[PDB]
Structures are given as C-alpha cells and as structure tokens.
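User: Can you model how protoporphyrin IX containing FE sits in this protein?
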Amino acid sequence: HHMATLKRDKGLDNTLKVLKQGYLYTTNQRNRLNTSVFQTKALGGKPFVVVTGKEGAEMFYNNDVVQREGMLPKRIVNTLAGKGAIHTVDGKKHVDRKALFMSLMTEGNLNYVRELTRTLWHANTQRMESMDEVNIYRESIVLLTKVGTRWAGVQAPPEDIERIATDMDIMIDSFRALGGAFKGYKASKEARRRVEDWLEEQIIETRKGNIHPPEGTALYEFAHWEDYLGNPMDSRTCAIDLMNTFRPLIAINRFVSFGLHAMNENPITREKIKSEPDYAYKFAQEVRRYYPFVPFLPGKAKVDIDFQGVTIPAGVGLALDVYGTTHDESLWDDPNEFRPERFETWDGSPFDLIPQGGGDYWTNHRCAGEWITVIIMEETMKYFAEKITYDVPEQDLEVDLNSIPGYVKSGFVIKNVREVVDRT
Ligand code: HEM
Ligand SMILES: CCCCCCCCCCCCCCCCCCCC(=O)O
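Assistant: Here's the modeled complex, given as structure tokens:
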C-alpha cells in the first residue's frame, strides 16, 4: 499496495562502493536517487534500509520494531566490542547490565574524570615544551590512557601505558572494514586478547580479596555485580565489559585531534573558549556534531515498518545514518559549517545530535559515556586554548570524508609549546 516503492542503490553487494564514498555514501545516494530513504546491500549481499533524521532515529530506537541482536558484524564484535559485550545483548539482560554502566556516571565520578584530565594536562606541559613536535593524536591517546585506567580503578604501571594505548588504538580503529576481512584483523584480535588477559586478572584478584579497588570505580562495581537473576558475570565477560568502560574514553583522542583542528580553522574560537564561560561546552558539542566518527549503526526490522512513504519489510537490515543526521539540513542551519553558537538554542532532542547514538540511555544501546566525552573535551580544549601557546606548522590537515574512520591525516601536529604564565 500500500506504500510507495522503496528505491535501491542497485547491486548484489555495494560494500566497496560504501567504503570508497565513506561518510558521504548515504548522502550521495539520497541525492542521486532523490529520496530520504533507500536500500542497499553490503557485507555479502545483506539488504540494509538507510534511515536518517529525527524520524529515522526515533524509529531506529523503537525496541518494539527494531532489533539490534546479532547485527554488529562479527569481526567488529571480535575486535572492537568483545564477545558477549553489552553491545551484543538485548531485552531484560541488556537493560539490567546497562544500568550497571550508567550507575558509574555519578556527579562525583564525573567530577573526578574532570579533575584527572585537568591535572594530567597541567602536569604534561613541561614534557610538550621539550618535544620538537607533538602529534596530538598520539599524545592525547597516551594521556587519556592514564585518565581512563585510573578512572576505571584499573592499575596501569607507567611503563605499560604506551603499550596499552597502542593496543587500544588498534581496537578502536578496527571498524574500518565495516566487518570485512582486512590486513590488521589478527593484530587487532591479538591486541584485544592482551588487554582482556590483563583486565581478567584484575577482576579475579578483586574477587579474591587480593586487591581493593575503591568503591564506585568500574573495576570494583563490575567485579562484585550480580545480574537480575543473581549471577555475576564470568571473569572473561566481566573483563570485556570492564574494557567497555574506558577504551572508548581513550577513543576521545579522536575528538581531541578534531578539536584542535577546529580551533586552528576557526581562530576566534580560542578567545571565546577563554572568555565565555559556557563556550567550552558549545565548542565540544559542535566538535561531536561536525566531525565524522561513527558513520552509521546496524539494526534489523522485526516486522514490516511503514516509514516515510515506504514499507520496510520484516527481516531487512536497518542502518541509522549517524553522519547524515548530524549534518541534516532541516535539523541544523548550515550543517557543514562549524558553529558552536548553534548550541545556544538547541532544545536537547535525543534524536538529532546522535554522534554517539540516540534514544534512551537506560533502555536503548545509546552511548553510556556521552557526558564523560563532553567533560573531557571541555577540559582539554580549555587547556589548549588558555594554558599554553603553540604553533601549527603546515602539514596534511585534511579530514577525508570519503575514508572511514575519520582522522586528521597528520594527527594534528603542534610545535613551540609554551606555558602561559603571568610572572609580573
Ligand atoms: C570517544 C567517542 C565516543 C564515541 C564516538 C562513541 C560512540 C558510541 C556509539 C555510536 C555507540 C552505539 C550506540 C547504539 O548502538 O545505539 C556507543 C555505545 C557505547 N558507548 Fe560510546 N562513544 C564514545 C565514548 C564513550 C565513552 C567515553 C564511554 C565510557 C566511559 C563509552 C561507552 C559506551 C558503551 C558502554 C556503549 C554500549 C551501550 C549499550 O550497548 O547499551 N563511549 N558509543
Ligand atoms: C550503508 C550501510 C551499510 C551497513 C553496514 C553496517 C556496518 C556497521 C558498522 C558499524 C560501525 C560501528 C562504529 C562504532 C564506533 C565506536 C566508537 C569508538 C568507541 C569504542 O571504542 O567503542
């Protein structure tokens, strides 16, 4: 019957086309097919209906019609999320375990991550002054490894931090093939196993009473948690989900690199981060909206869904267009311009600013760490804008929108770092 016909990016499998157009694939198809919703096949002939905008996001997060079970590509589960991770469960089991993740996001725990971040950048100033150049992508990922492990209650000796950061970096990057085979797949599984082994030891030692992580940290709460049926997570699964509490915190290094990129590109933002109290928040929010990170999210239609003039058939894949929604003309005035001032009148909808998911924290798969992400970016941008001066030598600053994942090609390099001190 009874709806209009669902247009298609025709082909048995368009994975290579998706990979070559990257974050602009869905926009290109919508413009080429002149439509707001279309079907494409990928990952070996699997049909996906691409939905976007607020309506797309509110439908994608309707648990009565959309299923997330088994839709993350297996290789991404094996490298990025981990087997049996929170991302891979649905229903009461998911709601129960998600409440554990959300219980970490207290006012005091959020204030703690803010202070850790501020202290570590302040302490890092001398080191960056001594370096001839500083790759911000790499320097922030090492610093955030120190922040994240400590916030999670996980003991990481300083001699192991560079190793851990590198292993996290590999796992975070491992969605690049969208679940297809790729050269660094085994290196990614090996990195994950090293980190999993390390965390599982900490959980076991916590449960044995050999170490005593502080109450309220991820290590403590996860090791002692029981699900709604009375059963604790087995040690390996516990280690996996414990990693889910701070690996993505370490992934904030992507947004730190982007934030300095934005500051360099919009020079006046530096002064306003210094002088306007709310501005650091708005700049952080506009970095998350504007720069590419998560391209889209996979789901599956549980039943026929009537959506934007078409019928989405039961059993077809669904792809929530993350990049397309955060750059949706009709949601954001001049969406391809960096404009932190737009967040002066953003009404806080759960369904437009979705760079880390949409919907409800407690009953949807929406990112648990959005507050931490904003807090860490606020403090990091405040540091770079206010506590130090530096030079940006010319280098490859391109963010290739046709290449997933989004990166500044150089990683954003700075030189001539010097503390700002009033010694008068
Ligand atoms: C650094 C940038 C970050 C990005 C781009 C990001 C993005 C995402 C996305 C797209 C999802 C999936 C949403 C869905 O499936 O509907 C997700 C889930 C999740 N994120 Fe993040 N996130 C980030 C930071 C964080 C941080 C800092 C934490 C923890 C402190 C975190 C913890 C999680 C968890 C636990 C989930 C799974 C929740 C569930 O399945 O119910 N993330 N994130
Ligand atoms: C056109 C649609 C094609 C459909 C293919 C669906 C393939 C799904 C790819 C999903 C990519 C997930 C990216 C998640 C990034 C996670 C944020 C980093 C934080 C972390 O370490 O967890």
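A couple of observations from the model: The chain has one domain: 1-424. The longest helix spans residues 107-130.
User: Helpful, thanks.
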